[PDB]
Amino acid sequence: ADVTITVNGKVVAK
């Protein structure tokens, strides 16, 4: 790839 996107997230419980 010409560019690499790293997507971070999280699911927090409630």
Place this chain on the structure above:
Amino acid sequence: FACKTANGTAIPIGGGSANVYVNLAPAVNVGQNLVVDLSTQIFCHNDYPETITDYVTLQRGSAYGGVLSSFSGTVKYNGSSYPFPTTSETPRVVYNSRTDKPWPVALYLTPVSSAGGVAIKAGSLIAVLILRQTNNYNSDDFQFVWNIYANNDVVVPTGGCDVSARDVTVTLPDYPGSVPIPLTVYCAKSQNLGYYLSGTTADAGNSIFTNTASFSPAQGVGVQLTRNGTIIPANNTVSLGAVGTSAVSLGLTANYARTGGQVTAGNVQSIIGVTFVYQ
């Protein structure tokens, strides 16, 4: 006649060899991409300018080394462009002063992609240049060999266009939510530019990238990219239309997307590639 580098490294009368460590800042230009300008790195002078005229050429065999060695290009020598690697000796440049003056060499690479690049590790060889010095005095015929090394980590663009970043990280709000992806592209001259995503997808529509967070991963969600609300699946070319010298945003937004089953707490991560094409 003798030469020296910006850091004082010298090659004396009669020629020889020297290593030249340079900070690279490659850039796309129209029809060719700047790899390195050595006119600020290598200098030469005439030792007896009242009596002798010195002649300097870039000799054939001068070429890229390392990862760049497979790439064709051009060299600007004292303003004029010549094929690189050199298959024939350039014209002669006169040296007629004891004052050190630049060896006017700049190396370019011929675009072979749209917005591709090649990684240059610091300390690696990028080129070997053969300076040939003669004169109008005797039959002196001396080789000054300059081994050009990258002094830093850079990627050299191999296309007609370049990007705001080669690696981008964004952080979603805690689920649910979305975040803009800062990513722009520009071209040295107008290109009809498109791009497509690549990555591991979870759905039939190839539009939700899998959660590959290795530690304590969430279940039931993936990452889905939108462009002003339009879902961008993988391996589907998106047109940016004509892209010129003014940067154009790809307009991408990252979102969480249900992939199936109970959504559970944990980390989310997706690695998504972007590859540009001409249309």
